[PDB]
Subunit: 492 residues, 4 copies
Amino acid sequence: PSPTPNLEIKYTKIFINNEWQNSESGRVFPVYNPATGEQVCEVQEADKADIDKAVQAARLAFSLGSVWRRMDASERGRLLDKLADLVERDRAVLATMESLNGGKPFLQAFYVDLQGVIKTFRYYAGWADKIHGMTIPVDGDYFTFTRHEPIGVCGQIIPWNFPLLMFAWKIAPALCCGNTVVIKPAEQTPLSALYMGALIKEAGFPPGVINILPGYGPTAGAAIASHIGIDKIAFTGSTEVGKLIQEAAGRSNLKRVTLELGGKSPNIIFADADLDYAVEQAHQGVFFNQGQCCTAGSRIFVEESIYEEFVRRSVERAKRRVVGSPFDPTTEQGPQIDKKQYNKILELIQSGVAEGAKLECGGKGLGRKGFFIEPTVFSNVTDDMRIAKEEIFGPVQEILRFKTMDEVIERANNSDFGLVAAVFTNDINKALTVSSAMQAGTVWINCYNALNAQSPFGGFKMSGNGREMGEFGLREYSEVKTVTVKIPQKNS
Amino acid sequence: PSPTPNLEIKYTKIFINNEWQNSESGRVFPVYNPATGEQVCEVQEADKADIDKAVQAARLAFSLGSVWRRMDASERGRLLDKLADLVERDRAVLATMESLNGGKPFLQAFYVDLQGVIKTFRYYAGWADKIHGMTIPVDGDYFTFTRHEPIGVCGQIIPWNFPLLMFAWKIAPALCCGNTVVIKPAEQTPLSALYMGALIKEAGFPPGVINILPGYGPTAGAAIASHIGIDKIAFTGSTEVGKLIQEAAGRSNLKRVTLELGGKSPNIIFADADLDYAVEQAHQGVFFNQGQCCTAGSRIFVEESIYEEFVRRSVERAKRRVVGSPFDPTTEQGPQIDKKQYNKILELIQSGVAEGAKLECGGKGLGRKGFFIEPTVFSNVTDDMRIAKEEIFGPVQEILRFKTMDEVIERANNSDFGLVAAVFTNDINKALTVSSAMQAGTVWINCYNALNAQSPFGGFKMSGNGREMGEFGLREYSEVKTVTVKIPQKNS
Amino acid sequence: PSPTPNLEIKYTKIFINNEWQNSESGRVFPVYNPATGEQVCEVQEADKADIDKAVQAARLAFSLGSVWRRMDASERGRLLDKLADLVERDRAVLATMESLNGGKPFLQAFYVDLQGVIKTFRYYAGWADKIHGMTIPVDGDYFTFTRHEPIGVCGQIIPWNFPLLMFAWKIAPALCCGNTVVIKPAEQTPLSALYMGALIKEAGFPPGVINILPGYGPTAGAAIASHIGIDKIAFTGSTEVGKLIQEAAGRSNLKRVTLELGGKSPNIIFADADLDYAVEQAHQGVFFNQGQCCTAGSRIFVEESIYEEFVRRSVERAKRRVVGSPFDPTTEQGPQIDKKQYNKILELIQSGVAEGAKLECGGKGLGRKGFFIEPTVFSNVTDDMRIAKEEIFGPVQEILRFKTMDEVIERANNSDFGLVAAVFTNDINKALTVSSAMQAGTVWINCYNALNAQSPFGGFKMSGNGREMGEFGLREYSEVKTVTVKIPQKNS
Amino acid sequence: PSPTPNLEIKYTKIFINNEWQNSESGRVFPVYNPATGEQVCEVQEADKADIDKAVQAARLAFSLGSVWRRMDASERGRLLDKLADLVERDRAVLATMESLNGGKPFLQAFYVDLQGVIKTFRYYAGWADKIHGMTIPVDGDYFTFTRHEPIGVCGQIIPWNFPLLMFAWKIAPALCCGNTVVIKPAEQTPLSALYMGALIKEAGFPPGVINILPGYGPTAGAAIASHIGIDKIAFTGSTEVGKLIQEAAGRSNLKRVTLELGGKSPNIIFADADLDYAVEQAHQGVFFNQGQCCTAGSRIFVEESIYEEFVRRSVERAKRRVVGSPFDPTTEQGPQIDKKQYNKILELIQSGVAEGAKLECGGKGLGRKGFFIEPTVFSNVTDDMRIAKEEIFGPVQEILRFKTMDEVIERANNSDFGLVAAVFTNDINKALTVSSAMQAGTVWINCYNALNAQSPFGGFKMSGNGREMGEFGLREYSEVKTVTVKIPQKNS
Ligand SMILES: NC(=O)c1ccc[n+]([C@@H]2O[C@H](COP(=O)([O-])OP(=O)(O)OC[C@H]3O[C@@H](n4cnc5c(N)ncnc54)[C@H](O)[C@@H]3O)[C@@H](O)[C@H]2O)c1
Ligand SMILES: *[C@H](Cl)C(=O)NCCCCCCCCNC(=O)C(Cl)Cl
């Protein structure tokens, strides 16, 4: 596959009730190509007034007796499958847009992100008519059952590091369960979300079931978080804003909250691991998607006896990693998303030099247009360094050494985060002891970043709450109702 | 059974690490009998310094390799069953304490509250070794499974209207899942919870697994809600404090939050219901437990053709309702909990008279000592009256009229609350249509207040977040971990 | 839609390993049109040697490391969805074939049977990657989980009354779970099953995963039931043959057995039912599919006070029921399947007259070409009559009267069968009491023959064992393996 | 604990409807001590006439409106817990009976069998009120739910090798689900089951819910298997009789059937296993319970490089295994059950010698009284030998050698049985590849005979049908009913 030549950005308006609208204020905001710094287009800027219009449309679409509420659950599923068909048809267009707008190498957006999007919609297409309540053998002369209903209007806020994939992760389970949605893409990367609005219309979703509101965080995002007519919010982003979201839910209407936030995830390499394999997994585990990934394995603990060789191989690999234009097929790493993130990464790199970590390679920006940074490897990292504690979200690998299993379990768990973890060993007892002891929502054994539509994902500790993907991803998008019926005489 | 004669209050200290402790400040606080106003005893007053000690004890008991972590899940269940046996042995003592301290008629404390306590422990005793994760047929050469682990240190805050029962509702699922607990009873009603500490020690729970911290809201309660070493908080109480709890969770450490809060629940009586049964069920649905129940059916909608007869019968029932000493076996209604609640009820009664509802009977305090209120009935209630909107938590029945099913569904659902609802009709189509349309966590058909250990309970909208009881109550007290193992070759 | 003009039968051979094969013996057997008696075509006649070759192909396709075993579960689901797409593409052809071969009115095969086929494949397409095992908190220092594996080679035998729909009901869950299949359509109706083999190949199922073996019962069917290389058998047909199947499994290799067999199902009409609706539902409930349906409501019990009016309305409806050529859009009822069934029906009708049931209308064959029987209604049926006890499988309606709920529950359950039951009443207490007391696998309330892909179906008593459709339909097609791993130290 | 001095055998009669009855014929049968050959007592001999009375009693106890059918599910659970309490109270008496009657060393009966009995009853006590049906979001305007009802009268036939444990495994899930039971202990070992009747009466089960019918196979057992009034049969015993049971169910009334039958289970030892641990586990895995265990690891495959050392260590262990009086605390191995089993073992030992296996030690009877056999080890066993294919059920260990993982997987799976399997290795990849490839219902990794009340258990292939223990054990004892209600308008 090749990037779509001369990609037209057709959809730049607010999507409400299946109609393209200007912002109430008339304001628009610029969207950039992070690889060149040039403006790609302008987009209508949603603010609190547009959120209120979107919530009203989503609320009306959810009303008892509406098309969306009366629809067979199996037909909700068919609509998700139709949406997957349209994404597959437009796969190269959407991957080009993800590359252009988000800086991802086009072939990675096509084979990773877009494959994840399609598989997510197809997976949840299958769940819609398989969401079951229960019947319960309660005490007394009663018939008791549960109804698993949609919650209602779900507000969703997503970040710039996986714009389209996070859009799909959020709307697929919500729609699977029968909710309606007001979703706010990141101001950096609204474009593929807006294109999805055109596919949502083309697939035949009833108006108001999905409303897409491009805009800034403190305006549009905060309006969603505090809205008294939104029943549930899902947020993926920084831990700092996660706190604000949960606080705003409590101050407003006690909407249900799920969060996916930062990580500083440990990747533990025992001396019996295959080094060809573990070095490459650990390299991808921290450098994938320009380092802009919540799952980044940013604390690699390596057993002492293989530490020097592991560092040696990792440095050779980082020095070889190809940075360049996202449309070039040889590019492995594109730019960071913007100047703020670029500056944040360099400041943390500078703190690592100042705190005495060993800079093995990289450590500087490239002098090109856009926001490109050399693949950077630190060794001799220790637990109290800022780079060992703070999420970098950049192409910065950190390698630590350990001696014993009990020691590395303690150090791996000594974090306020707990998103993912990994252990590489062939010893069954160590693998299961370490994976059971990790305080993390996903633990990989002999792999890294193995995510699948079928398996739930989410944080321990301050990395978030709730799970996404899998069956358990549905639980955050339903409200349980118990119905208890007096009967004349109960028999088993 | 008879109230225990000359009940002495043996347990008045703070319970941490299975030992009885004085408050760090040295302060005690008085506990009163709401039927007489007399002081019953004094109890050690926990504050932030005591909460800090309790969290440390609970964290140590939760450490990997501890007695509580290593215990077979089936043996966690055995301990809950042993606790139930001890409650059963001491049922009269505990019911006497609930009557003396909480104002509940002794026979109701004995046959309702204590029965629910025993059944709750026995129910969750059976779940401990039946909490299952899953194995998942993910894409790719992987073996994927989930582990359902305890979260950690759970802080629990409970109110004064069901002191012992809410104690059991909170600690039983938490312990069943393997958590450790710091629990704060209401300052009005600490005594039965402290007695439970003695039984917890006698049953053999490891030290630090349950810690019981009597004290006030802004001191002990707020110290739990903002504690950075508490992983999860559960709260039952006012909507106003629930909002503060959820905000404090976001501001502090993003601890997981469940809430059970206010209600203004509708009870819908159709003309084809069994009338005398519906009158009695709706009477109990308002007046049970001195009206101090989150489930109170405080908006009774009666179809117009039976409205006058329903009111007349309801008024006759409320006039003969026996109000008196909780220890007297003829007493149906004890006092309200304290002067603050007493005054709140009286002011809402005045608002009902001022806004033109028809005071059919009652409406005043009874006697001079304690906090007794005449059973009160308002008819001709309309939806915009304060007594139709605000939770009263007193013995005040509100009766409204309606004409059509569509109308009453809309009016029932027009509420920021959504805790329970009921419909009385012999028509299967009406019953299913109304119960499916209610925006409430529990809907009763031809009954009211039918609560069972087996069935989940909780609020829609601002009545709460999450569910308690049943299998689903366990979901708030576990963390899901996904483990994904790379394998050489997958076969189905 | 309209019948495919001049339908040529393209597929007439045995389907093994995605190849079209002649019988090992060279023998063929004729296939007839039951509406004219004319021979439609000849089909290769499978016998024991052909079954043996098919089992070998299915076994090789199930080998560890094979394409079908290694495929992602989600990709097994995609293949079922592709098969559904192809059935939809060829819907009119397939409905024409079911009409020409089976006698079903074309419009019914198109809108009922073929819709069920498509919905069945699409439903199970969604389950394949959602079949989960469990992880278990066992006693001791162990990690225990379950794998739900396909059983292996499944033998399936289906009857002539729903040839294509039952073909789908059988193969869809078996393939969903990852099994391979040797399936034997009824000798009267092999044609649509053979066409499906072409679609199975076109969709891309690996060779040997589905093998289709047309032939006779005591030859091909018996060879499947006794085969020592078949792990599981599923049979739908007569109770008599079901007994032979279970016996043959015990005598041979103890293959797992599920059975769907006869019924004599009760349909209970209380005096408050809507007669316009209930008369039509009970009419369709006996007469659907020429009366050739296991779910037939062949014992209608009508409350005394509306019995005469119900009989009057039922007779009027039967007298207007249009019998004729299946291709005529106005036809409601086609012919019976063959002369043997035709003769069985008429002999039972004669038994009814001889035992004193009141023949209200019908009772004779129509005297044209083909096997057409007048729609027949008996009133004054009593429980001891042959027609009240024996499954007729023809267009014969039996109407009984009852007085009390206790009485009708006892008479309804006084059967060796227990496939289905129904109750028509608006009284919620009677509806739930009757439905709960029925000894039947499916109970309808205020409807009849409401079957859905999402709902499990199957018999109590001698109407069968196991369930089909829904999630539970999967349980008969997987084998549970428990894996228990010793670990150094368990923690919760 | 010590064996109970002066053990009186108090309960020797038939147990029907909670009454002790004489046999209808008047016959009694003798019961022997297999360590001495002496007669212990005589027991009333049930035959067809007694089965008939028991089925009538069980049917009446199951009728709608009976005490057992109306009981809260939670109270069925309380009765199982009470039965566990009484077994614990009488643990030493019951273990003395199992030792005296079954030949089990008393300490093994006390610490293994009786612990399993108690844990089984306590586990299923917790399931009774947690058996849930589902509510289902079907297509069309319907409300659909399932109820999981008890099947009815369950016949249960158990063997002599774990008399009390198998009695508990059978009646616990049946009663949990609400069935009634007619259970026939083995003629060799009726005593502990009859004692359980006294405890069942003492615990307070309603009359007729459990009926205990001591007697022989072709008389009492065949009467159960053929009974037209029994809904379900469960049988544990020989493969040959299991085939007869399944055939008899087909011939009689199509009762549902579960079977636990023979095994020839493989135990695979890789060179990288912990060798001394593996030797001891594999020794217990074949010699436990006098070798009379369906799970016996009677094909030990040892990787060639550790084969000679493994043989030498296994021979040393067998030569020191203490065979002697079951009441003696030094005894590890008691006698075989009776003269028939003794002779069958001796003949198979001769077969191994004749066919060229290396007799390393043992091979003859021990002493002159009772049925004691020397612990016997064969090495250089090959797959075609009779001792490698036929279940011995005696203290005969067989050791085989292998070279590759692919080879040992193929040889382990080349069997008509598939009850259990095990693999010993410290390599995670080999452990998971082998366990996934095994055609067996339980696979242990680095352990053997790790059985737990929480884990389901049962055979692949001819080792049986169905699963026992765990949640899945309940599925064989419930009947699923789908209830589908027409509703005016469906909303999600
Ligand atoms: N996958 C993730 O969890 C993820 C994604 C992006 C960034 N981060 C972390 O965040 C750091 C900073 O990046 P960022 O500033 O773009 O993250 P961010 O949290 O500010 O932005 C994520 C989303 O939150 C919206 N948002 C911002 N402020 C909001 C507010 N006050 N109220 C409601 N919504 C608001 C944003 O518009 C965007 O849609 C990064 O360095 C990284 O460490 C994590
Ligand atoms: C005995 Cl199994 C028998 O005759 N069964 C057929 C009953 C068919 C009822 C009408 C067809 C229903 C079509 N719908 C479906 O197949 C749904 Cl997908 Cl379950």
